[PDB]
């Protein structure tokens, strides 16, 4: 079932069949997240999930290409994604078309940009890790220290947080490490998406549209309070279909919602494998 | 050319052709503002509009219904509008469907509920009037205002500005004041649900103009306010701002799509 970072939720036949719906880790979790959304779609459809690798955004997609094009041929392909598995499913169309494969589908479940852009600069990291110190005296009801910024303003994403870890611990506070990986992994994939380098796509893509971002990804970025009509889509996709949900983010992956999700999905499914005739 | 308040862009050839679009006049505008769209549709496709009659949003669409059946009979209907003409198909596409008829097409350009309700308070026609002053870059007696309803607001305002000592021709005044009472109509519409398809084409934003008319405007949400109204709604974004949705270059985008729609309403007959 678990093949490397591919898992099998719903396998395909030994030959022929249904063309296959490849779904996208979001950040913090797997592919079993898909599983709702699996129960609302055609019987038979096969569903394979891609789950985590390092890199930027375009990295991760330079390891899942090889491995759809060794499952999938020249297509079809359906790439669809909840929150960053949007992302990288999108990354994912790029890549394919890129090298000549038939992309039908792209289906993005809430995959949202920032109302505003988030700045890749010195300042930013200041502030951002002023908030969170803010947050942690709170929640810890601690005093903390002077930020030691020219140390962490140097750093990638994962330098950042390996800091603050290190100087967390020999603080004298030891957080199980589970806690820690999950945490640490969380936010760093949540960050690979601020400096994903979003390419023209020359397709149909489908977004399901929420009402909002939830409360934690407002706290873990202020600027998701705000978005767009079109998502921060609209520039890169001249063929784009926005399907409203309604709802929170958080909540667009999971019943009750998922079933407007499917719904709509299972007909764009039923015309592909109708033209496949 | 004009019968009553209905406006032929394209008559239909007396037997057969395609299926006819029925358009929605704007606020302060005819029913030539689609005649962009009509360019960017399939050939020959026929245009009626209907143009301003009086009443609340639901008494408008009580005039054109017995009209639109007149003219198609059963259906299929195909029905457009941008800004408070998008309102106007919506409203007709109920009606229809009350009367059983078959309704295949709810084109929305741009029309876009405001992000909170207007209040029908005395504060609010207070604040409003308010900020029309202020933007005179007179003095007005608040006790008289907030008792009137939209029409006689207007038309007492418009009476203390000529008292004043201003003179605006009054062929602008009048066109002003139905433009006016046109878009501030949409404000108390009774929305109801509907069974089909809608399409809304959605810009950005609204214009700036908009906003000073109703400051509410600044604020939009991803659904236009139609998703608790419509289960099958489609939004097709198109960039730009709500008084260019309807020019173009935006309304190719519109066309673009609004095309392979009505292809497939045609083959389907
Ligand atoms: C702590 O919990 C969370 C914190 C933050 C998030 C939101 C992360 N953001 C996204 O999912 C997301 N960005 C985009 C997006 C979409 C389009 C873009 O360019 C056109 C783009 O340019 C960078 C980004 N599409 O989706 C989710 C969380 O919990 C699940
Ligand atoms: C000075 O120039 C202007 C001033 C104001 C406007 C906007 C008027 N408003 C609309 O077009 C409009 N409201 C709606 C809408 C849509 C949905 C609704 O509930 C579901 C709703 O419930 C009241 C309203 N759909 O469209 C346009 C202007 O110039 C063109």
Redesign the interface.
């Given at each position: 079932q678990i093949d490397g970072f591919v898992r099998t939720l719903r396998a395909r036949p030994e030959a022929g069949g249904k063309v296959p719906v490849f779904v996208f880790h979001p950040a913090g979790g797997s592919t079993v997240v898909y599983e709702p959304l699996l129960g609302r779609l055609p019987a038979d459809t096969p569903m394979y999930g891609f789950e985590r690798v390092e890199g930027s955004i375009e990295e991760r997609a330079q390891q899942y290409v090889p491995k759809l094009i060794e499952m999938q041929g020249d297509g079809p392909y359906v790439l669809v994604g909840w929150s960053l598995g949007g992302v990288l499913a999108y990354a994912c169309a790029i890549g394919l078309r890129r090298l000549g494969k038939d992309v039908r589908f792209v289906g993005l479940i809430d995959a949202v940009r920032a109302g505003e852009e988030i700045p890749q600069t010195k300042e930013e990291i200041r502030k951002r890790w002023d908030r969170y110190a803010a947050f942690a005296e709170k929640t810890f009801n601690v005093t903390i220290p002077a930020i030691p910024y020219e140390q962490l303003e140097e750093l990638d994403d994962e330098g950042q947080v390996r800091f603050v870890l290190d100087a967390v611990s020999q603080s004298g506070v030891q957080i199980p490490a589970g806690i820690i990986e999950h945490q640490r992994t969380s936010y760093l994939d949540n960050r690979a998406i601020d400096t994903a380098q979003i390419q023209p796509y020359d397709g149909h893509v489908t977004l399901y549209?929420?009402?909002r971002y939830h409360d934690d990804a407002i706290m873990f970025e202020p600027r998701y309070a705000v978005?767009?009509?079109?998502?921060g889509?609209?520039?890169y996709v001249?063929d784009?279909?926005?399907?409203?949900?309604?709802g929170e983010h958080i909540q667009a992956i999971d019943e009750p919602i998922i079933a407007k999700v499917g719904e709509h999905m299972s007909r764009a499914l039923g015309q592909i494998e109708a033209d496949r005739t």
């Open positions: 549209m929420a009402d978005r767009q009509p079109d998502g889509w609209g520039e001249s784009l279909e926005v399907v409203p949900i309604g």
